[PDB]
């Protein structure tokens, strides 16, 4: 209950992450990514990243749309699979849910998890910092400086994406 939505939102992020990582039918994989992508936008919004949160929302939605727009185009199965369907996907799925639910249980019952790195359960509200931001949002001014402080990044990103359209046609042209 509203203690801290960060863990709850990130949990749905992982459960949605478990989904398409279990190799469903590609269209159902898009749904599994989208829920994680949507709630992931929620996590960043809660942390103050208002622009970046909706940013990954808009781009990914368009990104994954052409993803499963493609799957029904030429990657569709004449009998599509589902979350239950084959025992392999069933096994791969339920493995993911039982896994993550084990770690969070391992997480929330001692608060001194030491897998790989250190993870202590005390509340992600704590790491926040006390201080104003004047009359500007910090994130918006940071990504705005791309056209003033990041002229080098603009060049390499712009050129790569322009080359990105060249390769896409060149690869897909053929013959």
Tell me which residues in 59-98 interact with ligand CDL (CB under 6 A). Answer: 82-84
99 touching ligand CDL, by CB under 6 A: no
Provide CB contacts within 8 A for 155, sequence distance 6+.
Answer: none
37 touching ligand CDL, by CB under 6 A: no
Q: How far is the CB of 1 from other proteins (least distance, A)?
A: 10
Buried-state track 30-53, b at ≥16 Cβ within 10 A, e below 16: bbbbbbbbbbbbbbbbbeebeebb
Place of tokens 């599994």: 32
Reported as type and span, the H/E element at residue 66 is helix 50-74
> Could you say which residues in the range 36-75 bind other proteins, by CB under 8 A?
36-37, 40, 43-67, 69-75
# of chain residues touching other proteins (CB under 8 A)? 132
The DSSP bridge partners found for residue 113 are 119
26 touching ligand CDL, by CB under 6 A: no
Q: Which residue, judged by CB position, is nearest to ligand CDL in the bound state? A: 83
* Residue 81 to residues 32, 38, 61, 78, Cα–Cα distance (Å): 14, 24, 23, 10
# of chain residues touching ligand CDL (CB under 6 A)? 5
> Could you say which residues in the range 101-140 bind other proteins, by CB under 8 A?
103, 107-108, 111, 113, 116-140
The residues that touch ligand CDL, with contacts defined as CB under 6 A, are: 19, 28, 82-84
């Amino acid at each position: 209950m509203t203690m801290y939505i960060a863990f709850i939102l990130s949990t749905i992020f992982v459960i949605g992450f478990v989904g398409f990582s279990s190799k469903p039918s590609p269209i159902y994989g898009g749904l599994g990514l989208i829920v994680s992508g949507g709630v992931g936008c929620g996590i960043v919004l809660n942390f103050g990243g208002s622009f970046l949160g909706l940013m990954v929302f808009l781009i990914y939605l368009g990104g994954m749309l052409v993803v499963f727009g493609y799957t029904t185009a030429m990657a569709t199965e004449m009998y599509p699979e589902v979350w239950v369907s084959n025992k392999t996907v069933f096994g791969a799925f339920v493995s993911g849910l039982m896994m993550e639910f084990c770690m969070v249980y391992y997480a929330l019952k001692e608060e001194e998890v030491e897998i790989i790195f250190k993870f202590n359960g005390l509340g992600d509200w704590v790491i926040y910092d006390t201080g104003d931001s004047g009359f500007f949002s910090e994130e918006a001014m940071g990504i705005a400086a791309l056209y003033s402080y990041g002229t080098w990044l603009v060049i390499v990103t712009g050129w790569s994406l322009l080359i990105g359209v060249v390769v896409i046609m060149e690869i897909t042209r053929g013959n």
